[PDB]
Amino acid sequence: NKNKKKKKTDFIPYRDSVLTWLLRENLGGNSRTAMVAALSPADINYDETLSTLRYADRAKQIRCNAVINEDLNNKLIRELKDEVTRLRDLLYAQGLG
Amino acid sequence: NKNKKKKKTDFIPYRDSVLTWLLRENLGGNSRTAMVAALSPADINYDETLSTLRYADRAKQIRCNAVINEDLNNKLIRELKDEVTRLRDLLYAQGLG
Known part of the structure; x- marks a missing residue:
């Protein structure tokens, strides 16, 4: 997504464990994966x-x-200090304070 | 008072006895005190x-x-809430708010 093209398939380690080896087809390629943790x-x-x-x-x-x-x-x-400052400034600017 | 002022509060020996030490705030500062003499x-x-x-x-x-x-x-x-109320009332009464 970042660039838009890179080609080099790199090498995703799939043979390091039998779990990832058997799930190779599901994990990779045009697929989707989700992870639910309790x-x-x-x-x-x-x-x-x-x-x-x-x-x-x-x-x-x-x-x-x-x-x-x-x-x-x-x-x-x-909030009260800011409101007091704002109202005092308004009154002083308008000449009523 | 005799003159008017000049700082220099000197120092009253309050630690010289436990009586005056315990009654530090009553003899002076934050208290109203009455002496009764017999x-x-x-x-x-x-x-x-x-x-x-x-x-x-x-x-x-x-x-x-x-x-x-x-x-x-x-x-x-x-006090801040009362100030906000006062400023709001002044602004709305004068047609500023």
Whole structure:
């Protein structure tokens, strides 16, 4: 997709294991493949669940980026301060403050 | 006060005794304080009585920086919301918003 042509079939290792060897026709060529991974919600199994995620991260390894949420109280403080600044600026510009 | 100001708050020996140390905030700062003095009417105690009255007089000159308390963690939020309400009311009443 990136370029548009490259030809060189490379060499996808199929003979390294019998599982991938027998599934050669299904995996490659004009075909489609899907991967469904199961997750356990229990805390006690935490590491194992993480391991599944590390195995579920495969087949692309896309970028999940940073994940974080500001505190809701701090969010309200920030929004209120911005609103106060905006309304004060409007009043001062219009001469009513 | 005698003059008006010039900084230099000096230092009152509060650590010299546990009594004054524990009562640091009550003698000065965030509190309203009342002194009650007891007098023995007999002549024999006269000097002692005078001393009490003298120190009692000095107790009148002390000024305290009393504050209520509230809770800034929530009173800041309340004050910002009230400011937003005031600015909104001013803008809508004057036809600016």
